[PDB]
Amino acid sequence: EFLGDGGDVSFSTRGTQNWTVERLLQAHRQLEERGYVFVGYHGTFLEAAQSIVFGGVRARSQDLDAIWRGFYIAGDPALAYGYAQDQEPDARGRIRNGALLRVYVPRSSLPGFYRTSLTLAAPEAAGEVERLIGHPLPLRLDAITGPEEEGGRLETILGWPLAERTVVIPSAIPTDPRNVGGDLDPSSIPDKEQAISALPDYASQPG
Amino acid sequence: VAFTVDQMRSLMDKVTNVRNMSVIAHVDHGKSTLTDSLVQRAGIISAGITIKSTAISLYSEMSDEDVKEIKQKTDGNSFLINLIDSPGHVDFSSEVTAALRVTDGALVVVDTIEGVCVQTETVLRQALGERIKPVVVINKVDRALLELQVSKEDLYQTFARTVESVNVIVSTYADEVLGDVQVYPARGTVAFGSGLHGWAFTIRQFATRYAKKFGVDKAKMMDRLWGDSFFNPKTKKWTNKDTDAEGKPLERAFNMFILDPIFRLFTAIMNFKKDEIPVLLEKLEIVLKGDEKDLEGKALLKVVMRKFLPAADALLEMIVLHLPSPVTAQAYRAEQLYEGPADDANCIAIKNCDPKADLMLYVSKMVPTSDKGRFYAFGRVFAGTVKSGQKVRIQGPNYVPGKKDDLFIKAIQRVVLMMGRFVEPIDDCPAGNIIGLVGIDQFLLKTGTLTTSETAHNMKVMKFSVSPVVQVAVEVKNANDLPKLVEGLKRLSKSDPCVLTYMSESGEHIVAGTGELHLEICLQDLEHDHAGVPLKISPPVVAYRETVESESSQTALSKSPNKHNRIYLKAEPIDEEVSLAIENGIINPRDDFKARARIMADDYGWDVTDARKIWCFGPDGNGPNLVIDQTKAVQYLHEIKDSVVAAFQWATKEGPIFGEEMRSVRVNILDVTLHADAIHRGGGQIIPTMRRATYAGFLLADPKIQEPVFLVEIQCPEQAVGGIYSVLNKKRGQVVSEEQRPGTPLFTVKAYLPVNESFGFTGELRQATGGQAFPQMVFDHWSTLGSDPLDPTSKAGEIVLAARKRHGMKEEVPGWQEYYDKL
């Protein structure tokens, strides 16, 4: 269990149940002690969050012809924050807020984390991403980080294999239930979570 | 006994032989016990739809001789008594008046030891105000003997004093027109007894007995059985002085022929003197039946007394011989019950309890049935006759013969008899009877008038309101029973028209009611019946409203997450008139946009242009908030209309000041830019945008909050009226008018009481007016506070901050910037 201790954890529109900053600091420390490292944030819907935290991240019927298929995450919680919410309305018409997740991989996989300046989603980068990872896309036991789009913030795409080997836990960064769609407010990020959120240094040259 | 629909209908045709009454009594005075006894005695049963017991049918027969003693037109020896249910506590003001308004007679229960208690005294006044004839019963006599071991003469003096108190009230508050309505034991309008043991009697009962043993026409036998009348055992003569020629005392007739017999049976039996009991019993011709013979102590007395003086009959005797039929009373009660011309074609039809005239049916209350979550109307036919299928005009509270507001010309699906818990279909029902209707639930909230005359006014309306102004959050103490709460809440709302249960965005379960008590009750019934599961209830809270005072400082703008769609809008105030118009069905969401436009344009000064572009109302798609489409040439615009509306429904249900509902907020969509492809303009994208732009607009349009305010009507003796103004001045109350009832010393103060200041109001008014005051308060209007909700120290800000904290939100209110584009 990597959730530290303190009573069952759940995801609510109300806030994440039983997940203080303090518990976060304990669970992080313990993940490092077992040789895991933090690589980014992942925002998504409550139902989804629960699944990932209790059951882990798992691909499921991907489009095999989809060369950028993977698990997207982001170093900057703000960028992740944007996906932290229902993507479609419930029957009544409500679009509730989501949750922010902290993604960790076995430190033993860093050798496969690369970076580029080109912008991911298009073909011009494909060749260069492939150049950096040593084999044609999609990514597999490797990950690429680069600008979400020209001048945008950076996103990270863990290939499905690697993704399935992550360990995800709650963030102490809450989504706002009364401002769904707003941008993450920098002062709502715990100073202590900020301390344990540096990213590893990714390679820019192939191996 | 059991009756067929025919028997009942037949019985309902002889209105001269019907009795509509209630039982005025404090619960701790055997109110429920006595009532039962009548049911267990004359309760009418019919020879799969259940309802909430509102009235009980009673049958009673009398001798052609008895029928003559009735100083009011009658016909036949059969009688139909409608026992209409009453509340337990007086606080239920509004519904107490409800039952009274449909009754003609009243069985007032007073206590032997305690006499007439304050509460019963108050209801009595009210009953008198509706011109209800009272009939008294001094209950709990046993407690006098067994406990106090009072003498025959002391107990006499007691009843004397008690009857005296009652009449002090009856004479002081009844109408001079009605004539002397005081109760007189000698005239058979006062019974004495004990609900516990199940016995009671009237002077008229012992007078029919000792009737011949003295060679008298009971007229003079009962006349002697009370007051100062004596029978010297020795001279064997009747005198009018408490002493014989020598100066020795003489026992009163009452003490001699009534109290003595009873007093001995008590002394005999409770002392277990088995030698006397049998002898004593045979003398009164009381035959124990086998098993009862071995009984002793209370067990015995209890059975002897029941065979001796059957409590049920004593009461049924006064009901028939003294309470007015729906014919005698409507003649002098009509004018008071019709809010139209005292000579109007209908008002007349009311006086004459005319079954041929245009319908005049009064709906006193809606009662919950098993058949779905539907409600059957309960009331009385004051004129004409109501029949299944008959199409009727359902005139609601706000109706006025002039306009067409609050009218619903529909057809009466089914007419049924309110046989307590069960209903029995009946073709028609002539004036003078209490009946039930099926199929009005969606036209009448609670009270109303049904007619046929197009020129018929409503009958004395009872102000009620469905405005949730007080609510609480319900939580289960033990998470396991959660589903059991989710059911009861659904059950609760189903039992009451005016209770509300819903879920906030926060996912909390809310229970909102008409007031402090109304909610209180609802919460009890939930943790005890509907859910029966232990719950965590939050403290009572007043429902506020969020509104704007002007147009948005500047245009409000928000863009979807795609950053591909934008919504430009401005918010501006709606005029209270319009809001009221919306709240009052005038401006209607379901109307023809054109017709409705014409209305707003004409009667309310709106640009027929704007009004024809209303996209939706809100919340719940019908509130006093609107979204006007003022865009110009925005391609695909209609393809995001459902989203926008949807967004609006949430924006208006929980505003940005502190989660409260919006009121009178006009949202004008000035512009919109959308992505060419629909994939990127879905609900997930527009809904949040709109919702956020609206918030932005609102926060820019000078935010303010409204508080709800009650209109309290109070009945109170000139003497205690002091306590009223006393308490009103410590609650920010505002006196609207004070009047006096011509004859009596009964003032009736009306004032405005802020709902957030009404907590524990009745309790405080109690102490203040020595308990003589009788409150009736309803929701009246929304008041816009002047102070700035944004300034924590201001008065409104104080409300806001607290509320926000309560809801565990960020202490400060969001600036418009947070919702505007982060540009």
Q: What is the sign, positive or negative, of the torsion defined by CA atoms of B374, B379, B382, B388?
A: positive
Closest-CA distance of chain B to residue A180, Å: 6
Q: Do B187 and B229 belong together in one domain?
A: no
CB B691 within 8 A of CB B536: no
- Residues 6+ away with beta carbon under 8 Å from B518: B470, B498, B499
Phi then psi for residue B374, to 5 deg, are: -75, 160
Amino acid letter at B495? S
Rounded CA-CA distance B484/B528 in Å is: 12
**3-state SS, one letter per residue, for B254-320:** HHHHHHHHHHHHHHHHHCCCCCHHHHHHHHCCCCCCHHHHHCCCHHHHHHHHHHHCEHHHHHHHHHH
Q: What is the sign, positive or negative, of the torsion defined by CA atoms of A148, A154, A160, A161?
A: positive
Nearest CA in chain A to B563: A181
Structure solved using which method? X-ray
Rounded CA-CA distance B232/B244 in Å is: 7
Q: Do B189 and B262 belong together in one domain?
A: no
Dmax (CA) of chain B: 120
Q: Do B744 and B629 belong together in one domain?
A: no
Chain A residues in contact with B506 by the CB 8 A cut-off are 13-14, 177
Rounded CA-CA distance A1/B230 in Å is: 98
- CB-count exposure of residue B327 (10 Å: 0-12, 13-18, 19+): buried
> Cα B137–B139–B142 angle (5° rounding)?
145
**Nearest residue to B458 via CA among B470, B467, B472, B448:** B448
Which residue, of B637, B668, B702, is where some domain finishes? B702
Rounded CA-CA distance B760/B741 in Å is: 28
Q: Do B596 and B723 belong together in one domain?
A: no
Q: Do B639 and B560 belong together in one domain?
A: yes
CB B627 within 8 A of CB B616: yes
**Nearest residue to B403 via CA among B584, B249, B576:** B584
Rounded CA-CA distance B450/B9 in Å is: 21
Question: Which residue range is the domain that position B603 belongs to?
Answer: 549-702
Give the count of domains, chain B: 6
Strand partners, B395: B407, B449
CB atoms within 10 A of CB B248: 10
Retrieve residue B510's tokens: 């809310």
Chain B residues in contact with A185 by the CB 8 A cut-off are 818
**3-state SS, one letter per residue, for B203-221:** HHHHHHHCCCCCCCCHHHH
Domain-wise residue ranges, chain A = 1-207
| DSSP 8-state secondary structure symbol assigned to residue B369 | B
Three-class DSSP category at B416: strand
What is the CATH code of the structural domain delimited by A1-207?
A: 3.90.175.10
Using CA atoms in the order B94, B96, B97, B103, what is the torsion angle rounded to 10 degrees?
Answer: 150
Retrieve residue B151's tokens: 């003498």
Amino acid letter at A123? P
CB B105 within 8 A of CB B133: yes
**Nearest residue to B508 via CA among A23, A166, A177, A42:** A177
B475 backbone φψ class: left, alpha, beta (φ>0; ψ -120 to 50): beta
Which residue, of B282, B297, B325, is where some domain finishes? B325
- Chain A with chain B: Cβ pairs closer than 8 A: 59
Q: Do B247 and B288 belong together in one domain?
A: yes
Tell me the CATH number at B275.
3.90.1430.10
Q: Is B196 annotated as a binding residue?
A: yes
Rounded CA-CA distance B173/B170 in Å is: 6
> Cα B77–B83–B87 angle (5° rounding)?
165
Q: Is B32 annotated as a binding residue?
A: yes
Task: Give the end-to-end CA distance of chain B in Å, rounded to a whole number.
Answer: 82
Closest-CA distance of chain B to residue A96, Å: 8
**Resolution value in angstroms:** 3.1
Q: Do B439 and B470 belong together in one domain?
A: no
Q: Do B458 and B475 belong together in one domain?
A: no
Strand partners, B393: B409, B451
Q: Do B469 and B506 belong together in one domain?
A: yes
**3-state SS, one letter per residue, for B690-702:** HHHHHHHHHHHCC
Q: Is B675 annotated as a binding residue?
A: no
H-helix segments, B429-481: none
For an interface test with A, give the residue of B559, B687, B813, B817 to mutate (most A CBs within 10 A).
B687
The label of the residue with tokens 């609802």 reads: B522
Rounded CA-CA distance B106/B31 in Å is: 13
Nearest CA in chain A to B687: A95
**Nearest residue to B121 via CA among B669, B719, B774:** B774
Retrieve residue B672's tokens: 């919109």
For an interface test with B, give the residue of A8, A10, A179 to mutate (most B CBs within 10 A).
A179
Q: Is B756 annotated as a binding residue?
A: no
Comparing CB atoms, the residue among A95, A182, A185 nearest residue B687 is: A95
| B404 alpha-carbon distance from chain centroid | 27
Is the CB of A85 less than 8 angstroms away from the CB of B818? Answer: no
CB atoms within 10 A of CB B593: 12
Q: Do B315 and B332 belong together in one domain?
A: no
For an interface test with A, give the residue of B475, B810, B813, B820 to mutate (most A CBs within 10 A).
B810
Rounded CA-CA distance B112/B106 in Å is: 19
Is the CB of A82 less than 8 angstroms away from the CB of B561? Answer: yes
Tell me the CATH number at B134.
3.40.50.300
Amino acid letter at B514? T
Check A22, A47, A130, A155 and give the catalytic one: A155
Residues found in chain B: 823
* CB-side neighbour CA atoms (13 Å) of B330: 29
Instruction: Tell me if residue A155 is catalytic.
Output: yes
Interfacial residues of A (vs B; Cβ cutoff 8 Å): 12-14, 82, 85-89, 93-96, 177-183, 185
Q: Do B613 and B674 belong together in one domain?
A: yes
Check CB contact of B682 with chain A, cutoff 8 Å. Answer: yes
**Nearest residue to B469 via CA among B542, B522, B539, B521:** B542
Check CB contact of B817 with chain A, cutoff 8 Å. Answer: no
- CB-count exposure of residue B237 (10 Å: 0-12, 13-18, 19+): exposed
| B553 alpha-carbon distance from chain centroid | 48
Check CB contact of B698 with chain A, cutoff 8 Å. Answer: no
Q: Do B477 and B437 belong together in one domain?
A: no
Cis peptide before B573 (omega within 30 of 0): no
| DSSP 8-state secondary structure symbol assigned to residue B528 | I
**Nearest residue to A57 via CA among A174, A197, A160:** A160
Residues found in chain A: 207
Task: Give the end-to-end CA distance of chain A in Å, rounded to a whole number.
Answer: 33
Nearest CA in chain B to A15: B506
- Residues 6+ away with beta carbon under 8 Å from B720: B768, B769, B770, B772, B773
Tell me the CATH number at B610.
3.30.230.10
- CB-count exposure of residue A171 (10 Å: 0-12, 13-18, 19+): buried
